[PDB]
Design a binder for this molecule. Structure first.
Ligand SMILES: C=Cc1ccc[n+](C)c1
Lengths: 156, 39
């Protein structure tokens, strides 16, 4: 199948027509997405198969063909871009200054951008084009607005 | 049966649309990976 680096839509034919359930990143031969997009199922890429390699429900992340490769982190000061890939629509870059999720185990960057559930797994990048996390696991705040964590894995 | 389809390159766009605010929120993360607001 297609192994070229880049952003990909994750599709299913199980429901009506062809439905986009999420998005992921191909980097260094490994496919990276959020756990809630695939639930750990195998994926097809053309005539090839991608098998899960690592995953964790609590982090809400999963990697295919190899270990998690993304290790860039938000610097805590600069604006970033969500490379949003919405269902049936072209990939588009959106610049924003992240907010913060403060937790008992430390602080996490967060992006206050509202896209359909099928955009889950879209990458958040720094000014060097490095993926600092994936968009799509977050919360609904007081005014009904959506805020996603910048979710990043660990490179072993 | 899930499949993937290329959507583009991962690159920073100069002069992209700039939007969104920067809220500071107290949150909790449960064992199922769900975030919730702490009040
Ligand atoms: C991008 C994913 C998303 C967007 C809005 C709401 N939720 C739960 C998830």
């Amino acid at each position: 199948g297609e192994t070229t680096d880049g952003v990909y839509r994750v599709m299913t034919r199980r429901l009506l027509g062809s439905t986009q359930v999420g998005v992921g990143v191909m980097q260094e031969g490994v496919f990276h997405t959020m756990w809630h997009v695939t639930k750990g199922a195998a994926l097809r890429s053309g005539e090839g198969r991608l098998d899960p390699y690592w995953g964790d429900v609590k982090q809400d992340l999963v990697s295919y063909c190899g270990p998690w490769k993304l290790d860039a982190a938000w610097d805590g000061l600069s604006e970033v871009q969500l490379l949003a890939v919405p269902p049936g629509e072209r990939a588009k870059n959106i610049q924003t200054l992240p907010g913060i999720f403060k937790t008992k185990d430390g602080d996490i960057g967060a992006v206050a951008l509202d896209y359909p559930a099928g955009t889950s797994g879209s990458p958040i990048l720094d000014k060097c084009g490095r993926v600092i996390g994936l968009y799509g696991n977050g919360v609904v705040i007081k005014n009904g607005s959506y805020v996603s964590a910048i979710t990043q894995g660990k490179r072993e | 049966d899930m499949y993937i389809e290329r959507a583009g390159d991962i690159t920073w766009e100069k002069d992209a649309e700039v939007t969104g605010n920067s809220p500071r929120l107290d949150v909790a993360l449960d064992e199922s990976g769900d975030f919730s607001l702490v009040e």
